[PDB]
Amino acid sequence: VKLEESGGGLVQAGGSLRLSCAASGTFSIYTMGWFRQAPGKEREFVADISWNGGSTYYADSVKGRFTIYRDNYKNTVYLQMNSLKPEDTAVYYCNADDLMIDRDYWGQGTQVTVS
């Protein structure tokens, strides 16, 4: 299992960005999620989505501005970010928690910088 993140980069405050996390490489199923990491700080939960898409959870800092969703055809989970703020600047990581074997997997991380 490999997770490849795409999107990100430099964005003006008030803008929007969509991050993607494409899974590749069997077939268990997964809780997929997004975390972010500011320099010198704890890893911060952002959002996650259940294996069948029926339940989503968001950190209070992003509720009402961010949306997590899954496109099964592309085997990709997405993070739509609106009204971006300097406080959102971080490396964003997607995670996949294998519910059959209790092992999780991580993307390489993608920088989002809000100017």
PDB file of C-alpha atoms in Angstrom:
ATOM      1  CA  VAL A   1       0.000   0.000   0.000  1.00  0.00           C
ATOM      2  CA  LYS A   2       1.339   3.381  -1.106  1.00  0.00           C
ATOM      3  CA  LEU A   3      -0.254   6.770  -0.566  1.00  0.00           C
ATOM      4  CA  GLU A   4       0.733   9.578  -2.934  1.00  0.00           C
ATOM      5  CA  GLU A   5      -0.343  13.111  -2.066  1.00  0.00           C
ATOM      6  CA  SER A   6      -0.835  15.798  -4.677  1.00  0.00           C
ATOM      7  CA  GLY A   7      -1.836  19.387  -4.648  1.00  0.00           C
ATOM      8  CA  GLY A   8      -0.700  21.993  -2.220  1.00  0.00           C
ATOM      9  CA  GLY A   9       1.830  24.735  -2.618  1.00  0.00           C
ATOM     10  CA  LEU A  10       1.566  28.468  -2.134  1.00  0.00           C
ATOM     11  CA  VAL A  11      -1.892  30.015  -1.860  1.00  0.00           C
ATOM     12  CA  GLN A  12      -3.135  33.465  -0.933  1.00  0.00           C
ATOM     13  CA  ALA A  13      -5.033  33.954   2.294  1.00  0.00           C
ATOM     14  CA  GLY A  14      -8.741  33.567   1.611  1.00  0.00           C
ATOM     15  CA  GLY A  15      -8.105  31.116  -1.204  1.00  0.00           C
ATOM     16  CA  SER A  16      -9.025  27.479  -1.676  1.00  0.00           C
ATOM     17  CA  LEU A  17      -6.963  24.394  -2.415  1.00  0.00           C
ATOM     18  CA  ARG A  18      -7.850  20.743  -2.865  1.00  0.00           C
ATOM     19  CA  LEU A  19      -5.388  18.079  -1.680  1.00  0.00           C
ATOM     20  CA  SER A  20      -5.533  14.581  -3.073  1.00  0.00           C
ATOM     21  CA  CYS A  21      -4.278  11.302  -1.692  1.00  0.00           C
ATOM     22  CA  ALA A  22      -4.148   8.455  -4.205  1.00  0.00           C
ATOM     23  CA  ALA A  23      -3.835   4.953  -2.878  1.00  0.00           C
ATOM     24  CA  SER A  24      -2.122   2.323  -4.990  1.00  0.00           C
ATOM     25  CA  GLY A  25      -0.880  -1.203  -4.635  1.00  0.00           C
ATOM     26  CA  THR A  26      -4.706  -6.735  -2.493  1.00  0.00           C
ATOM     27  CA  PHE A  27      -7.785  -5.083  -1.007  1.00  0.00           C
ATOM     28  CA  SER A  28      -8.491  -4.431   2.650  1.00  0.00           C
ATOM     29  CA  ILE A  29     -10.492  -1.356   3.619  1.00  0.00           C
ATOM     30  CA  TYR A  30      -9.487   1.753   5.437  1.00  0.00           C
ATOM     31  CA  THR A  31     -10.341   4.717   7.533  1.00  0.00           C
ATOM     32  CA  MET A  32      -8.694   7.509   5.522  1.00  0.00           C
ATOM     33  CA  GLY A  33      -7.632  10.752   7.095  1.00  0.00           C
ATOM     34  CA  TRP A  34      -5.743  13.990   6.929  1.00  0.00           C
ATOM     35  CA  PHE A  35      -3.308  15.306   9.510  1.00  0.00           C
ATOM     36  CA  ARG A  36      -1.100  18.351   9.443  1.00  0.00           C
ATOM     37  CA  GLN A  37       2.172  19.313  11.030  1.00  0.00           C
ATOM     38  CA  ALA A  38       3.395  22.849  11.666  1.00  0.00           C
ATOM     39  CA  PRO A  39       7.122  23.306  12.354  1.00  0.00           C
ATOM     40  CA  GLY A  40       7.969  22.536  15.974  1.00  0.00           C
ATOM     41  CA  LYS A  41       4.397  21.496  16.881  1.00  0.00           C
ATOM     42  CA  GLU A  42       2.341  18.371  17.481  1.00  0.00           C
ATOM     43  CA  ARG A  43       0.831  16.528  14.540  1.00  0.00           C
ATOM     44  CA  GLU A  44      -2.756  17.775  14.355  1.00  0.00           C
ATOM     45  CA  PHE A  45      -5.794  15.790  13.269  1.00  0.00           C
ATOM     46  CA  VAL A  46      -7.703  17.542  10.471  1.00  0.00           C
ATOM     47  CA  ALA A  47     -10.405  15.188   9.167  1.00  0.00           C
ATOM     48  CA  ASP A  48     -11.203  11.552   8.517  1.00  0.00           C
ATOM     49  CA  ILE A  49     -13.801   9.457   6.709  1.00  0.00           C
ATOM     50  CA  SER A  50     -15.075   5.917   7.405  1.00  0.00           C
ATOM     51  CA  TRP A  51     -14.572   2.978   5.059  1.00  0.00           C
ATOM     52  CA  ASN A  52     -18.030   3.302   3.482  1.00  0.00           C
ATOM     53  CA  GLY A  53     -18.039   7.106   3.455  1.00  0.00           C
ATOM     54  CA  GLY A  54     -20.938   7.276   5.911  1.00  0.00           C
ATOM     55  CA  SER A  55     -19.169   9.089   8.716  1.00  0.00           C
ATOM     56  CA  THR A  56     -16.808  12.052   8.680  1.00  0.00           C
ATOM     57  CA  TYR A  57     -15.046  13.860  11.490  1.00  0.00           C
ATOM     58  CA  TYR A  58     -13.383  17.288  11.512  1.00  0.00           C
ATOM     59  CA  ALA A  59     -11.145  19.194  13.888  1.00  0.00           C
ATOM     60  CA  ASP A  60     -12.868  22.265  15.322  1.00  0.00           C
ATOM     61  CA  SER A  61     -10.247  24.517  13.676  1.00  0.00           C
ATOM     62  CA  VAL A  62     -11.409  23.444  10.199  1.00  0.00           C
ATOM     63  CA  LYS A  63     -15.065  22.503  10.618  1.00  0.00           C
ATOM     64  CA  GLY A  64     -17.188  24.524   8.239  1.00  0.00           C
ATOM     65  CA  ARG A  65     -14.191  25.395   6.036  1.00  0.00           C
ATOM     66  CA  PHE A  66     -12.823  22.027   4.950  1.00  0.00           C
ATOM     67  CA  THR A  67     -14.517  19.012   3.342  1.00  0.00           C
ATOM     68  CA  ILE A  68     -13.182  15.448   3.172  1.00  0.00           C
ATOM     69  CA  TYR A  69     -14.524  13.065   0.542  1.00  0.00           C
ATOM     70  CA  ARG A  70     -13.627   9.892  -1.365  1.00  0.00           C
ATOM     71  CA  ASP A  71     -13.794   9.171  -5.140  1.00  0.00           C
ATOM     72  CA  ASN A  72     -13.763   5.386  -5.338  1.00  0.00           C
ATOM     73  CA  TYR A  73     -13.165   5.299  -9.109  1.00  0.00           C
ATOM     74  CA  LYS A  74      -9.852   7.166  -8.650  1.00  0.00           C
ATOM     75  CA  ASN A  75      -9.131   5.405  -5.318  1.00  0.00           C
ATOM     76  CA  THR A  76      -8.382   8.897  -3.983  1.00  0.00           C
ATOM     77  CA  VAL A  77      -9.383  10.739  -0.816  1.00  0.00           C
ATOM     78  CA  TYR A  78      -9.563  14.509  -1.031  1.00  0.00           C
ATOM     79  CA  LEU A  79      -9.369  17.454   1.312  1.00  0.00           C
ATOM     80  CA  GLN A  80     -11.117  20.562   0.013  1.00  0.00           C
ATOM     81  CA  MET A  81      -9.817  23.603   1.908  1.00  0.00           C
ATOM     82  CA  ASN A  82     -11.643  26.946   1.827  1.00  0.00           C
ATOM     83  CA  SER A  83     -10.899  30.367   3.281  1.00  0.00           C
ATOM     84  CA  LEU A  84      -7.306  29.441   3.968  1.00  0.00           C
ATOM     85  CA  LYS A  85      -5.477  31.293   6.717  1.00  0.00           C
ATOM     86  CA  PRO A  86      -1.841  31.653   7.770  1.00  0.00           C
ATOM     87  CA  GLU A  87      -2.678  29.297  10.682  1.00  0.00           C
ATOM     88  CA  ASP A  88      -3.303  26.574   8.059  1.00  0.00           C
ATOM     89  CA  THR A  89       0.311  26.590   6.849  1.00  0.00           C
ATOM     90  CA  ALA A  90       1.724  23.109   7.449  1.00  0.00           C
ATOM     91  CA  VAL A  91       2.823  19.864   5.882  1.00  0.00           C
ATOM     92  CA  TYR A  92      -0.376  17.893   5.263  1.00  0.00           C
ATOM     93  CA  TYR A  93      -0.290  14.098   5.567  1.00  0.00           C
ATOM     94  CA  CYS A  94      -2.880  11.569   4.540  1.00  0.00           C
ATOM     95  CA  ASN A  95      -3.238   8.353   6.484  1.00  0.00           C
ATOM     96  CA  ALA A  96      -4.952   5.035   5.801  1.00  0.00           C
ATOM     97  CA  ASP A  97      -5.852   2.841   8.772  1.00  0.00           C
ATOM     98  CA  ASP A  98      -6.266  -0.805   7.689  1.00  0.00           C
ATOM     99  CA  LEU A  99      -9.228  -2.036   9.672  1.00  0.00           C
ATOM    100  CA  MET A 100      -8.542  -5.736   9.041  1.00  0.00           C
ATOM    101  CA  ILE A 101      -4.927  -5.804  10.311  1.00  0.00           C
ATOM    102  CA  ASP A 102      -4.681  -2.730  12.589  1.00  0.00           C
ATOM    103  CA  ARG A 103      -1.799  -1.181  10.694  1.00  0.00           C
ATOM    104  CA  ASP A 104      -1.733   2.299   9.290  1.00  0.00           C
ATOM    105  CA  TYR A 105      -0.030   3.852   6.307  1.00  0.00           C
ATOM    106  CA  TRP A 106       1.130   7.405   5.575  1.00  0.00           C
ATOM    107  CA  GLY A 107       1.619   9.648   2.589  1.00  0.00           C
ATOM    108  CA  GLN A 108       4.872  11.538   2.077  1.00  0.00           C
ATOM    109  CA  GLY A 109       3.340  14.866   3.029  1.00  0.00           C
ATOM    110  CA  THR A 110       2.669  17.954   0.974  1.00  0.00           C
ATOM    111  CA  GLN A 111       3.460  21.523   1.980  1.00  0.00           C
ATOM    112  CA  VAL A 112       0.652  24.067   2.012  1.00  0.00           C
ATOM    113  CA  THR A 113       1.832  27.640   2.497  1.00  0.00           C
ATOM    114  CA  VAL A 114      -0.744  30.381   2.976  1.00  0.00           C
ATOM    115  CA  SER A 115       0.639  33.805   2.113  1.00  0.00           C
TER     116      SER A 115
END
